Design a protein around this ligand. Structure first.
Ligand SMILES: CC(=O)N[C@@H]1[C@@H](O[C@@H]2O[C@@H](C)[C@@H](O)[C@@H](O)[C@@H]2O)[C@H](O[C@@H]2O[C@H](CO)[C@H](O)[C@H](O)[C@H]2O)[C@@H](CO)O[C@@H]1O
Ligand SMILES: CC(=O)N[C@@H]1[C@@H](O[C@@H]2O[C@@H](C)[C@@H](O)[C@@H](O)[C@@H]2O)[C@H](O[C@@H]2O[C@H](CO)[C@H](O)[C@H](O)[C@H]2O)[C@@H](CO)O[C@@H]1O
Ligand SMILES: CC(=O)N[C@@H]1[C@@H](O[C@@H]2O[C@@H](C)[C@@H](O)[C@@H](O)[C@@H]2O)[C@H](O[C@@H]2O[C@H](CO)[C@H](O)[C@H](O)[C@H]2O)[C@@H](CO)O[C@@H]1O
Ligand SMILES: CC(=O)N[C@@H]1[C@@H](O[C@@H]2O[C@@H](C)[C@@H](O)[C@@H](O)[C@@H]2O)[C@H](O[C@@H]2O[C@H](CO)[C@H](O)[C@H](O)[C@H]2O)[C@@H](CO)O[C@H]1O
Ligand SMILES: CC(=O)N[C@@H]1[C@@H](O[C@@H]2O[C@@H](C)[C@@H](O)[C@@H](O)[C@@H]2O)[C@H](O[C@@H]2O[C@H](CO)[C@H](O)[C@H](O)[C@H]2O)[C@@H](CO)O[C@H]1O
Ligand SMILES: [Ca+2]
Ligand SMILES: [Ca+2]
Ligand SMILES: [Ca+2]
Ligand SMILES: [Ca+2]
Ligand SMILES: [Ca+2]
Lengths: 103, 103, 103, 103, 103
């Protein structure tokens, strides 16, 4: 299996790496019906979503989606540096597929 | 798909953005029957709930309701600055739909 | 809908408010069969349980029971000041219905 | 309903209280099949498990077993002082039934 | 039942102990389809996965797999020293079976 986010991201169609090397600037979370999601931004204005669970997910990606929103919240609150995100770039905002964190 | 809490709130009827730019002053949680809910307040007396799950919520919102109460608890304990709340204003106290945090 | 713990407590029979204004002194939790519960005390010796889930609880409370134990453990570990508890006072020890944290 | 760990421990056969008054020295966790468990140690070498779930457990204990593992991990990572453990002494290592924390 | 990670690790085929005595250098998390997993690395370049749940795993392991990803995330964010890992060495990268923390 790939051993880093760059290699993991490159296996998938319609994906790309954003290199942030920065903490999350804002964290937004919604419980509204059909927008049960999180949205993050960085200081540079880059904005990312964790997608609303739907038909494009295999429904074990379901637990993974919830984990990812947990990780973004704790990263925000701990000012953890986000190294890279692997995103689907065919969504607006870009939708997070993977995150890497390093000091 | 919205990129911020203001645009997301505008997708919903009978909602309003409140801007607090302040940490939560009090956090209340209840397990009592029919009042399984959370209430937050700010120093200025603004008071909001996460509603008891009911018929105004769809299946997809149930997990998000639990998530939002987790988020408010950790935000209170971290003294995290709350930027904005998107709220349903036909409820008293007003009911949270979404939160944004930035500092 | 109540906007504070005192008003919420008054919607039930056999409840009362304790005003602690103090951090949790001790936190005890048990996985022993039929005693799957938590117990907290304060420096003045006031002692409270989260009750074992049983037939006296409705389905909607089961998540909220789990949540309350999560809340008491993180409040203990962060030395958070507990303002008030709403408790059923026909249990020994008093059983927690709601909690408020402020200051 | 007991009001302290010592009184809870005395409801059960084959138990005893260990009085540690110290933080957890090591935390071990396993996902290997048939050893889905946690093990903690103290500096003096006292060693305790949270049992692998099985037919020795009633249904109401399964959430509490998961909770106890959560509690031990956060206790370890916060260096929380463990006052007492109630354990079954007919297991090797001794199996945790309850924990109390105080400072 | 084993009392430490080395003895646990000797219970399985195709496993070995790695002794790190270091905090995790990076934490990677993916929800990408069929690759829902975490990857950690240490400063020496040692790289480990928590494997995607699949047919090598029995039902009793599924909660433990999710727990182990929770553990690595919080270990990462607390800069907790990892003492040893027990891994399956017939995977790439080596797959985590168990973890011990001590400092
Ligand atoms: C506890 C209390 O009475 N506080 C009030 C504020 O009202 C609460 O908070 C607002 C946001 C809402 O959730 C109310 O239902 C609560 O009782 C009150 O805020 C104003 O409330 C009105 C309600 O229609 C509008 O939301 C305004 O936009 C708010 O400014 C303030 C000011 O009147 O006074 C107390 O702090
Ligand atoms: C361990 C012990 O005996 N503690 C007592 C207090 O009682 C405990 O805490 C109260 C809140 C209740 O849960 C009891 O069942 C516990 O044993 C005791 O508190 C008073 O308790 C009575 C009820 O029995 C009323 O609730 C009063 O409002 C409480 O002040 C205090 C003071 O009497 O003494 C020991 O700390
Ligand atoms: C190539 C890389 O990114 N790192 C390597 C180490 O290998 C990685 O980590 C090990 C533990 C294993 O998961 C490999 O699959 C990874 O690529 C490599 O560690 C040694 O790896 C060998 C197996 O190839 C043995 O497991 C040794 O015990 C490990 O120390 C080291 C060489 O020491 O080089 C880079 O750090
Ligand atoms: C809120 C906003 O419009 N911000 C702009 C950035 O765009 C956002 O973030 C990127 C990563 C995508 O999720 C966008 O959909 C989102 O609106 C914008 O970032 C650039 O977006 C490009 C696509 O339009 C592309 O992904 C590029 O890689 C990325 O750098 C930046 C720079 O143009 O400006 C912000 O204001
Ligand atoms: C690794 C080791 O040998 N530790 C010693 C303790 O034993 C461990 O911890 C106890 C609580 C049990 O879980 C043991 O199975 C485990 O090895 C030892 O504890 C004493 O062990 C006695 C018999 O093994 C008996 O259980 C007794 O209750 C307990 O106090 C302590 C104290 O002598 O020393 C460690 O070195
Ligand atoms: Ca800062
Ligand atoms: Ca402060
Ligand atoms: Ca202190
Ligand atoms: Ca220390
Ligand atoms: Ca550091």
């Amino acid at each position: 299996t790939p051993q880093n986010i760059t290699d993991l991201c490159a296996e998938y169609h319609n994906t790309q790496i954003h290199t942030l090397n920065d903490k999350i600037f804002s964290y937004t979370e919604s419980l509204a019906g059909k927008r049960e999601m999180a949205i993050i931004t960085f200081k540079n204005g880059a904005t990312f979503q964790v997608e609303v669970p739907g038909s494009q997910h295999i429904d074990s990606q379901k637990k993974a989606i919830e984990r990812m929103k947990d990780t973004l919240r704790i990263a925000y609150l701990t000012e953890a540096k986000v190294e890279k995100l692997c995103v689907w770039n065919n969504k607006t905002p870009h939708a997070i597929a993977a995150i890497s964190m390093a000091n």
